[PDB]
Amino acid sequence: DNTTVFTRILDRLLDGYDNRLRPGLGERVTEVKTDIFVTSFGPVSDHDMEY
Amino acid sequence: SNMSLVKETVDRLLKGYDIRLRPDFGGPPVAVGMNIDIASIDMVSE
C-alpha cells in the first residue's frame, strides 16, 4: 500500500489549498528562479522579422 | 494568517455568485472602460 500512503500524502497536501493565491500573498514577495535550456534555435525569418 | 483571511474573503465573494447575471441586472447599465496598449501592428496585407 505504498501507493496508498503516497495518495494519503497527496490528498493531505491539497486539503484547504487555494491555487488562486500565490505563496506569501500579503506578507512576502514570491521569488521565481528561472532557467532556460535551448534544445534548438529555429530558423530566422527575415521577411517577418522573427525567429 | 493573512492568506487564510484572503482565502475566506474570496470564498465569500464567490459563494452565491450568479455568473449568468451582469452587475445591476435589473438596474442601470454597467459602465465599462477600455484601455489598450498596442504591442505591434505586424503585417498590413494588400
Taking the CA of residue A13 as centre, how many other CA atoms within 13 Å lie in the half-sphere pointing to its CB? 6
CA pair distance B45, A48, nearest whole angstrom: 12
- Judge: B3–A27 Cβ closer than 8 Å, yes or no: yes
For A16, the grid coordinates are: 484547504
Measure B27 CA to nearest chain A CA, in Å. Answer: 31
Method: cryo-EM
CA distance readout (Å), B34 to A49, B37, B41: 30, 10, 19
**Binary contact (A25, B3; C-beta < 8 A):** yes
